[PDB]
Structure formats: C-alpha cells, structure tokens
Symmetry: D2
Amino acid sequence: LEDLLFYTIEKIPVHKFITALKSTGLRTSDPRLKECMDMLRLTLVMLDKDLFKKCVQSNIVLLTQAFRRKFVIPDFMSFTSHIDELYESAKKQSGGKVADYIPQLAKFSPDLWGVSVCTVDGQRHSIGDTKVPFCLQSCVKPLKYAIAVNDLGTEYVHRYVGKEPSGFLNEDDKPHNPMVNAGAIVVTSLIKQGVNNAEKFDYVMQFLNKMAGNEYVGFSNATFQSERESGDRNFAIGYYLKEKKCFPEGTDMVGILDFYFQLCSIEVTCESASVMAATLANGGFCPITGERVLSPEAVRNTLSLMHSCGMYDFSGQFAFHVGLPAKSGVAGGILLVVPNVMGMMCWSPPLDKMGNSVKGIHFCHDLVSLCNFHNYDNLRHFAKKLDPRR
Amino acid sequence: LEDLLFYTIQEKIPVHKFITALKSTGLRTSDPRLKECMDMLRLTLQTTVMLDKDLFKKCVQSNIVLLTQAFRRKFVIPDFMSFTSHIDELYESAKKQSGGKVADYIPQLAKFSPDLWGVSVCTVDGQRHSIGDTKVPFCLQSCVKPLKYAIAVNDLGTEYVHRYVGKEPSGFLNEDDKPHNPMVNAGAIVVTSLIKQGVNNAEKFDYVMQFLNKMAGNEYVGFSNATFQSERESGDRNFAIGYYLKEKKCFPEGTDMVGILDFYFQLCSIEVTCESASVMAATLANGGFCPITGERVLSPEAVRNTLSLMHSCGMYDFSGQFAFHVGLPAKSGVAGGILLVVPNVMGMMCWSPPLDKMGNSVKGIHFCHDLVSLCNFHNYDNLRHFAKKLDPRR
Amino acid sequence: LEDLLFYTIQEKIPVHKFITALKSTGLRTSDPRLKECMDMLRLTLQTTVMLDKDLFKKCVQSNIVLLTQAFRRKFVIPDFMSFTSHIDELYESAKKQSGGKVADFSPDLWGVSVCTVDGQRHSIGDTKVPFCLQSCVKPLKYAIAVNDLGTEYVHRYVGKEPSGFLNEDDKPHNPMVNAGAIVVTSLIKQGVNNAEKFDYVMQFLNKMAGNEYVGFSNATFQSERESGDRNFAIGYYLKEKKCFPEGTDMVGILDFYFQLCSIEVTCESASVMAATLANGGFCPITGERVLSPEAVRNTLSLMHSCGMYDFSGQFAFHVGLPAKSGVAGGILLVVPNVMGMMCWSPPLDKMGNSVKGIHFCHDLVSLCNFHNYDNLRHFAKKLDPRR
Amino acid sequence: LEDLLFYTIQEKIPVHKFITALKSTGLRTSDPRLKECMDMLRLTLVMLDKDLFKKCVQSNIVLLTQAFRRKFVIPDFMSFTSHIDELYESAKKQSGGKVADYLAKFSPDLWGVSVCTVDGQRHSIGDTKVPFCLQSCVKPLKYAIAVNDLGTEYVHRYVGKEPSGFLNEDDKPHNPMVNAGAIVVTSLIKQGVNNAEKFDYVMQFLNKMAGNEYVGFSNATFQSERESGDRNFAIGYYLKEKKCFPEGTDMVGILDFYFQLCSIEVTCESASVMAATLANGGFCPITGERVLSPEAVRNTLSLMHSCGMYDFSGQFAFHVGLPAKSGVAGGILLVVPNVMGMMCWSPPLDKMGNSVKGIHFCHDLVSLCNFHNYDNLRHFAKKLDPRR
C-alpha cells in the first residue's frame, strides 16, 4: 500500500512528495491529509520506506487514489491550465454594473474577478480574487433549501413551496419555488421552527460550515442592516405570504424576514463557496472533510431547482446552453455545480440585465464549450469537447 | 484473442450454450453488429452441435470486440438479466394502474385498448429487453417533436433553428414572437417548416423517414394514413396556429404553410412500436450514435439540444413536476407513448393509451416515477452516493 | 310670486294642508333650504292653525323659489309619491333575496335611501342603521383628491382604467382598487398629520352629505388595522415602486387608509353624498358646491368602469349606472342628473357585492330608464320617473 | 296650426325666405319627413299667403313647428355648427399618424365631420361625401342587428359583454368589438341562409339606419381583406376549434361574410345618420322609422363605450366619455346619446389604430360642450351646452 506508493515516487525528498501531492490537486491543508501532514511536521528532509509509510500510512487510501490517477480529473494540472485560460477570457469582459442599491454592494471594485474550483475528490484550484469575502445573497437560497429538505424531507417542504419556475404565487397558492424571493422567504420559515432567530442562524451557520469543510464563512452586519432598511419589496412579499397563509402555523413573520435578511448577508469567499458547491456535486458529502452534510434527496432537489430556477430570467437560456445547476446573487457570485465532477464559485460584482455576473456567466458558457459538463453532453461521444475526466 | 474468449465459456462448447450466454448480456441475435458472427454460426450448423477453438474463432472473428465486451461485462449495465427483472417488476406495478382516458378525438386513438401497455429498453450498448405489448405499432404523435427537432438542428445547426423557435418552456408566442419551443405545436409546426426546405412533402417525408430508420436502427418505422386523415380533418387548432404563425411571419421566406401543416400531420402519423422507438431513444442516449447499428445518426449538438428541451418542455404541463421527480428527458404524446432517455445509459418507450389529465400515459408516468425511485437515473442523482437506490451500472 | 303659490293650495290654508302637500313633493321639512319658511311656521303656530295671503307670504317668502318649483312639479321626479311607490316595490322584491354571506351585522338588515338632485327624499327598510363606508369611500376620497389637486396631478399617481398589481406605467390601475385607493389616500392633505387629515376628509364628507350623519367606527378601524396584512403588502410594494408622493410615510398612510374605510354612514346620509355626485358637485339639500365638476365627472367615470369589483363589466352593461360597493354591504349608486342613493344589505355574493343591492339595482334599471344608454325619447316599455 | 307658423315667418312669404329659415334649423330640404311639404313647394313653383303656405306646409306641420319653435335638441343650430367648424379646423391641423397601408390610395389629407342630431338636424364640413369602408366601425352596427333580431340572451350566449384587458373565462370571445367576437356575431346574423342573402339583409338594415343615404360595397377592399386575412383565419379556426359558432356554421363562409361587412362603404354623412339612429333609441332621425330595438341600441352603446376605441377605450371613455367605434379606414362613429351622432373620417391613424384627427376632434368636442357621459346637465361649469 504505502510501500507500493513509496516506490511510485531509495530516498524521497519531502519537497518532491509535496509537489507530487499538490499536482493531484489536493491541498496540504486538506482535513483528510492532516495525520500525514502532521506526521511530516513531526519528522521535520528525506524519507525512506519505513519512515515514509510512517507519515503516509494513516492517509494511505486517499494518497494512493491521488497518485494513481483515480480522481475525477486524472490530470488536474492540465485542467487548471484551461481554467486559467477561461478565467482570463472572462476577465476581458468589463461590462455590466455593480449593484449599488446598498452601500456594501457598491463598495466593491468592479474589477474583482475570481474562480474557485473544488472537485468531488477535494482537488482545488483558484485564480483571480478568491480569498475576498462577499455576501451569498441569493446564492444562499439553494443552500437553505437543502437544509430545509434535509431536515423536513421533500414532502413537508413542498407543502409550502412549489417545484417549478413561475414564467407572486402559483395555482396552489404557494410560492413557485425556493429560488424566488417569495419561495426563499417561505423556506426560511421552515428551518428550525420554534426557536429564536439567534439559534436558527447558528444552526444554519453550523450547517454551512459543514458544507464548506470549515472553510471561510462569515456574516456582514453592514449588508444585513442595509438589506433590512431597504427591504420594502421583501416586506411586501412577507405580508402577502402572511395574508395568503403560506407560512407554517405560529410563524412570526417579521422575524422570518429578519432571519431571511441575515442569511442573505452570510459571507463566503470563492474558495469556501466552491466547496459548498462541491458538497452538492458530491451527493451530500463534503469532498474535503468526507462527512455527509446533506441527504441525497436534499441535494437532488436543490440541483433540480438550481437548474430550472437558478439564473433568474436567464435560467432557461442558461439551462439550454450551460446545462448546469447554478445559483446567482446580487453580490456577483455564481454557485455552479457540475454533478459527479466538481463545484465552483465565480465572483465578479458587475451584473448584466438579468442580474447575473457578466464574467461569471461568460465563464460558465466558456467552461461548457470547452469540456462536456453539459447535462446532456454524452460521455462517449462528445465530439471536439475536452473531457477532464479522462 | 477470440482465443481467450473460448476459455471464457471444457474442450468443446455447445452452440446453444454460447447463445444463451450471449442472449443474457441483453444483446439480441438480431443485432446488426452481430451479423457476421451470427451468420457463421448458422452456416456452421449446416456443415454439421458444438465447437472448438478454430471453429469458434471462425464465427466470432469479426464480431469479437463486441462479443468480448459483452462477456467481459463492459457494457453499461453489467448485469442485464437482473436489471430487466426489475423492469418487469415495475411493469407489473404500473400494469395495475388502470386510471386515465384513451384519446377519443379521432377514431385511430380510440381504436386502442386501454389495456395495451408495454415497455422496451435499449441501452447504448444494444442491450434489449421488452415486456407488455412491444410489437403493437402506434403513432408517435407528439413523441415525434423531439425527433424532428433533432433533425433540423442536425442539418441546419442550433443558431438557425432557434431563429425561428425558442429554447424555453412557455409558463401563443414569446416576446420575440417566436414560438416558445419545438415541443409545443406552434414550435413543432415551425420546426417542421425548417426541415428539407425547397422540396415537396413526399421527399421531405422520405427524408424524415430515412432519418427515423437510421435512429431506430432500421427497426419498425411506419405511417398511419388513417391517423393522418383524421389529424388533417380535425386539425382546426393546428390550422389556427398555422395562420397565426404565417401572420406573425414565424416561417422561413417562401414557406407554404398549408403544405407545412400537411407535412406536420404526416409526421404525427408516423408509426413506431415500443421496440423500434426504444432504439430511437437509445440513440439520443448514445449521443447521436444508434446503439445497435453503430452508425452516427445525429450530431452531438442536435442530441444535446433535444434532450434539454425534452427535459424542460417534454411532459406538457407536467414538465416541471416531471423534471423535478423523474429528472429524465422524456416526450409524451396523445397516442400514449412516452419517449424516455437516460443519458449515457439507455433509452426506452413506454406505451399505454389511457391518458391522465395532463395528457400523459398514466401507466407510463407511473412507471417513470417508479423507475427513478428504484435506480438512480435521476438527472441530479449522484453516481458515488445515491443512498438506497440501486445502480444498474454496477 | 308667493301670492300665486297661495292660490295654488279657498280663503284660508290650514297649515297641515301645506305641510302635507310639501311632504308629497318628496321634500323634507328638515330641508336646510326650507329652514326659514319652516322656522316661520313654528313661530306662527306659537302666535296662535290657518294662513292667509299676508300670513302665508310671510312664512313662505324667504323660501319661495324652492317651494315654487316644488309645487310647480318642476323637480326631476315631478310625481315623487308615485316614484317612491315603485322604489318600495323594488325594495320588497329584493328583500326576498336572502342569499349571500355576511362579512367576517344582521343579514336581515336591508334598506334604500333616495335623494334626488332636487332634495327629494325617500327612505325604506333600515336606513338609519349606521354602517362603514369601506370601499364605498374610495370614489368619495378620489373625488376629494381630484377636487383639490386636479385631474392631471391625481392621475400622475394613479390610473384611469380597469385592471383586467400595477399597470404598464407602474401606477396602480385606478382609485377603485386597493392599491389605487391607498395611493389616492396619500394624495389628500399632504404635509399634515393623520388627525387633521381625517378631519379634512370628514368635513368634506359632511358637506357632501348635507351635514347628515357621518361618523367613525373605531371598532372597525382596530379590526381593519390588525387584519390588514393584504394592505400592508400593498403599501410596501407601493413604497418599493415609489408610487407615493415624495416624503410619504406609508405606515402612516395605511393607518389613514383604514380610518377612511371605517367611516360610518346611514342609507340616508349616504344617499345625499350620492346625489351630490349626481348633482355635479352641489349637495342637493344644502345647495353648497362641495366638489368641482372635474372631480365629480372623473369619479362617476371610474365608478362606472371600476366600481363593482369584478362585476363592473357585467354591472355597467346591464345596470349602466355608476356605483360603488363595499364589504359592509352598501352600494353607493348615482343616477346622473336625476338622483343618488344608498342600498345597504350586509350579505354579499361571490363578487363581494351585496346580494339585495345588486338585485335592487338590476330591478331599478329594468323598471325605469336610468340606464346610461337608455333613451329619453324612446325607452320602450320602461317607465320614466322624470315625467 | 300652420296658420300660427305662418305669421311667425307681413302679408306674404317669399319662398326662399322660408327655405333659409328652414335650412337654419339644421333641417334639410332633402329630409324624408319633409317630402310632402317639399313636393307641394315645387308643385306651386315666388310668394305665399296663408292658404297657399298652409297648403304646402300643412303636410308636415308638426316637424316644421318644432323646428321653428326651436324645440329641437340643439335649439340654436347655426351657432352650434360654427363650433363644429372651429373644432374641425382645429383638428385639421393634425398631420400626424399614418394611413393604413395594409386604403393607401386614400389621401391622408381627407378630413371630414358629419353631424346628425336626433331631430334630423344635419351639418357637414371637410370631405363628407367621399365613400370609405366601415371596416371596424361596422362591428357595433353588425352587433345591433344581431341583438335586434336574436335578443340579448342569445347573442351573448356566443359572445361576451366586457373588455379583454383570444377568449375569456367562458371560452367565448370577449365582446362584439373584437375581431374574435365580431366574427362570431357575423355567424349569428341571418343564419340558415347563403352569404348573398345575408349581405342583402345587413345591407337593407344598414340602409334603414342611414335613412337611405349612401351605403355601398368596396370589392377592392374586400378582395384585399380576404387575401391578407391570415390573422382572421387563425381566429376563425380557433373559434371553430373551441366550438364558439352556432351549430351548422360554415366557418370559412363566415369569414367571407365578415370580410364583406368590413368592406361596406359609407360617407361621413350617411354614417352620421347611422350613429344618430343609435342616439335616437333605434329610430332613424331623418326617416322616423324604427330600425332597432332599444335593447339592441342600449347594448351597442354600452359596448362601444367600453370596447370601442381599441386600447384607447379606457382613456377615451374616461376623457371623451362617449360611445364610439373606430376603424382602419380612419373612421370614427361617434354617438352622443339623446343628442346626436356623427362620423369623423381621416385616413391617418395613431399608434392605437384610431384616426388622429377624429380622436383629436372628439376630445375637443367634449371639452367644449358637456356631451360627456358624466358631465352634469345643471352645472357644467365653463363648458357649453348646445341644448340651450
């Protein structure tokens, strides 16, 4: 196992192993690599059979699979080369306008652009401004919906909200889906019922942590305050939803919107969020931690509704061309999921008429032109498309 | 080579025991890709029941690759015999769903017994299974919409086709005045206008028929003149659509709209069985390559576009719900057929005449829900973690 | 002058004889226009029961003109007694229709008040029972806005046409829908608090009613206030689309809005308001000009098209009279140039309109040609009260 | 009787003097109801005395008395037509809008306004006697015939009573004023008969309404409507599909009848009598004949009010406050209930599909006079009332 892996790389200089590992896409920071990385820390510049396996033994299974090219993208280093090329073609689109409707959204420089990819195997790549935290805004919708369905199951959740695109309420007298603001609001009321906004938020927060594999998650109070004061439309919705009895019994609405606004102000970076999208691409299992955050039905349902409802008015166009479930938000983030392969976060503040990141949208189209990630792309015949999984 | 495979089935090998092993891969002896081998076997049985290396290699030599993959269980569904057994269970479960009304609006659709129910599977590897009434021919009707839309996009390309017709569900014309998509009648009619322009219907129809043959691997494709006459006569709302389309200039220049409507009804009147249709379905599942004949019928462009639209628009008003729960591109028609594609896996046709309020076959819809509950074919199901679903792929 | 009148009713005229002929013109002795004359009779009765050219003239002098037109049969309904006879018959017929559901007031409560443009009054049923204007206030308050701010201003904020939340211009559809009524409410007496606002609208409402009963139900207000989720939704959507005038406090505007819906009237009191619109802005009993013709016309047009909720198209077609209904069960009904009236029954039909009222309005038009498009010269079988 | 009249008009009465007086009440010597009295005048034909006057005038003295005793709706007509002129001139200066090309022959310069009161008083200015197709203006007329023969309950079994805002909740067209409804109405009239007979009937009906003034048919327009009528065929098949026609209806035929109806020709003059008939409660003002039941006239006016102007109907009914019908030929059939009716014709149409000049004229008409539905008769403020 370890021995086998040992030769694969009479004495192994650590830095040689480190690079070999970093080329598989895995990060030394990987939670699943801790024991091995610690063991390396302990020993620390060259390793031998007995010793190597001493460090590696604990993680050997994951290390073997990285080195013996069994990850979803066998050649990651090449794949990231294309990601960079794509990232840069999109960088060249300066159009669109940053949402100014609140000061926190206005602050952001138009030229912040980043793409963070995390596969279902935990292979990571980043380019651009990945580490800059920004608000999930509408990107939180699929996430909290996932939490909702995960906790309460599909049937309960959809007693309250619809399964399809509108085209305020539908014929059943419920919001059309969780991706619209009315739907999202209703969903917000389903999560952790009978508890105060503080604990509710803590719960959701801890849940987003699991999804991120404990990568950066935060809260913008500045954004929250601005969301609250300027939230007149959301209030109009709340009051309508209340009058239509769309909420669970014993719901304090004004609280649900307070809660709702908070979720929208939850902060992420491209990195942290790409892992969240990976958890969705991995069937509920966080790729880096390996823990099961969400139930498959919750993930399935979410991926469905990001497909149909995800892009706002660009959803149909998006689904037809990109053919991938994705979530957009006013922050300029696009949470993009390629099922069974990877997930990613694209962030640029400038948005188009539809309200989606211009660069992100551009990048998504490009990404799918290049590789066959399109839902209806065929695995055996994809014509001239590049397949990163081979 | 073949040689290795001989040991993969004693010194001398009964012919019938080679057959049953082959037939168990889900493959059929009728397979066009098996012909050279199947013929050597039939010929050899003349020169007489049993074989030896050299004699075996004599028969299997041409088709070994396919035969090797089959006996090396390298096909999509490695255990086909087990998978089909589940299909039969789901079939029986749906057979118990007698609700729904057969479409009476014309004599040809009313002629059908409410109890005609069949399912046919064809994988991308040519593995076949059928149960219920597979052999009974019925009109595609709306099941033809994706197929003819595939043809247009194949010939004319995405960009052109969608100048005339839209890419998304309606939710008569969209904002740009094009029909909403190829899946609605307004769209299907427009698309019908795009195929084989500048020729008379007879040749247009023949072209479309050629195409359909290739897609069915030359299995049964036919025409019901009875239905065509009745579609023609009763087609008032299609004509309304035709005139609105002409008035709105949705058709290409020089289009003859009354003729395009004749062509349209003709296409709706094209006949298939569950078997022949399931192969057409598997082609879309196979990225444009007919799973049984190995020929490339459709461009990946066309196939992808079609699957997307069948996903969003294919189930009528049950589309949103269908895509959510079943999560497979599918197409329903008044005939009671459901053209179902599981990408990268297989394709199938479920046929029952009784329709639900949405217009979809009751037993079909029921079967499709069940199908996805059992196995993870749902678009967004995970290949690694599908919980307690079963995965025929392994 | 009055001389003539004298001989129109022997050497001496018993007073009762004068009152009874007067009350037959449909006029009421309480008519503010009759005050002087009636004051004089009560005084003469103190200085005692008969009148004479000099005594008479002394009483009827001040009021002659009205009293003259009254007895020259020159009012709009020349024969009132015979008209009110039919109203009573129409009342009893509609009374027999008990279908409908009360808002959640007895279901049995039903009543009709007629006030013509000449001040002629008739009342039957429970007409003194006070009830909330509710949506019946919408036209009245729109009339105030148009009156004060002019047509062009008011309609910068709200639309003139039936809906078919906001229209293409992002204004509410009209003053008759809630969104439109809430916006309109925002137009009246800007820059002042709700107390002074409410008074202003109330004094206006008093003039329209000829100072007849106008009141406010706080019980209703508190209810409409807590249960108002629908309107608060509308208030925020309105605020979000900037449909209000700059510097509007919407939460305050909504409170004002609930206040206007809670204003109480009676069938009688209200019928005068209706007759005011029928009179081109002049309260028929006082003679004061309450509203501008511009305002009165705009209101009637919108009551015609938008007034009955979803029954507007059907009501305007068949009845052809501008009218407004409210959840309280009242129907504000105006016959232009003729009269105005208030039908009130609590039980409502599926449309939100009073079962009895709606029935009455249909009956009314079938009998008399008041229909917008009925003809004055050839009405066929319809009776014409103006002759 | 007539003796009374005679003194009103010295010992003897030069005929021309009676003419000009007669013509000044707005009446026309061409007036059908004056026929007997006009006959007698040429019979005698340059002065008249009692006997002789009473001889010629006796015939119709009730009309001549009313006219000369200013008992007509507009007592001072000669003043009123002066304002109509001013209004006409004011409107004639609107050069905006486009002629319907889809008629192009018609010069955009053509503008005319014909007035006919409920008393038979006539006035014309601009291009009155140029014939033009009713087109959509025929819809209310068509509907009135239907409701006249078939009654309210039957006609509205097939078509709706209210504005749209293709079919309504009941699956019937929204009203007679939309092509869908108009087509349906057309299938209602004179059923069980061939289009040749159907057309003759509607033609005779329209004649009545016009008091036998010009009514005609443009085959040119008709052929063109048929060839370009794809929209109407689409509607036709949809109606057929939804079973909106009476059973046994030949849908393709109806469309043809429909096309023919839109191609019927009127002049501002003949058409104003039609509108006047609708203003007079179904009685043709000039003939005196009863053409339409009050039921039909009332229903027609209601629907013209709400549905008449296309998308401008709401804006129109609000401001103008008069029932009217507009058409692609640039015609506007305008009805003032109980007062008069008129046709305003200019080819160029605004974005709404309404005659630019006509619309402009109507607005001016109601600003000047209180003909507005909800204008008050006692207090109109600063408006002008032709009825006094």
